[PDB]
From Swiss-Prot, chains A, B, C, D, E, F, G, H, I, J:
Annotated source species: Homo sapiens
Record note on quaternary structure: Interacts with S100A9.
Lineage of source species: Eukaryota, Metazoa, Chordata, Craniata, Vertebrata
Residues carrying covalently attached carbohydrate according to the record: Y10
Taxonomy, superkingdom: Eukaryota
Listed result of changing V24C: Causes formation of an artifactual disulfide bond with PSEN1
Binding site for Zn(2+) 2: H6, Y10, H13, H14
Recorded consequence of changing H13R: Only 23% zinc-induced amyloid-beta protein 28 aggregation
Listed name of the protein: Amyloid-beta protein 40
Length: 38, 38, 38, 38, 38, 38, 38, 38, 38, 38
């Protein structure tokens, strides 16, 4: 007579002027805010 | 007599002026806000 | 006599001036807000 | 006597001035907001 | 006089006896290999 | 005098006995290989 | 006179007896290999 | 007669002018706020 | 006269009897190999 | 006259009988190999 209860909790996010908001599992590419050449 | 209960929780997101809002599982490409050349 | 109950939770999103709102499973292409050349 | 119950939850999205709202499973093409050349 | 060149690379996949081969941008439904009740 | 060149690369897939081969942008339904009840 | 060159590299995957091969950007649903109740 | 109860807690985030807000599992690519060359 | 060159490297993966092969950006759902109740 | 060169290196992975092979950016859900109740 087992009982399995899981709750991921309450998440509130307030974000302003955020370039990258989020979780990246794996990153091998390029993440650049601004690129100026020449 | 087992009971399996899962809840992913309450998610509230407020975002303004956010370039990339979201979760990337795997990133091998290029994510650039602005590209200026020459 | 098992009981399987899954709930994905309540998701509320408020977004303004967001270039990319969403989750990318895998990214190998190019995601650029603005491209200026020459 | 098993009972399988799945609920995907309540999703409310409010979006204004969003270039790309949505989830991309896999991305190998180009997603550019603006392209200026010459 | 800018030059923008992007290549997504060479992808070779060999898969045998794979339930789910592919990238999911966002998952809120149920993905179960086998369901047995009663 | 800008030059924009994009290539999505070479994709070779060999798959045998694969239930679901493909990329799902968003999944809220049920994907079950086998369902047995009673 | 800028030059932008991006390469996503060479990816070779060999997989056998893999339940879930792929990258998930965000997961709020249930991913279970086998469910047995009662 | 066991009872398994897990709670992920209450998370409140307030962020302004944040380049990268989020958790990266593994990082092998380049994350640069600004790139100026020439 | 700047030159931007990015390479994501060579990735070779050999996997056998792997339940979940892949990178998850964010996980709030349940990932269980086997569920037995009652 | 700047030159920006990035290489993500050579990655070779050999894995056998691995439940979860991959990088998780953020984990708030449940990851259980086996669940037995009752």
């Amino acid at each position: 007579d087992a009982e399995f209860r899981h709750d991921s909790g309450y998440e509130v996010h307030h974000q302003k002027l955020v370039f990258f908001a989020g979780d990246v599992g794996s990153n091998k590419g390029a993440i650049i805010g601004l690129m100026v050449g020449g």
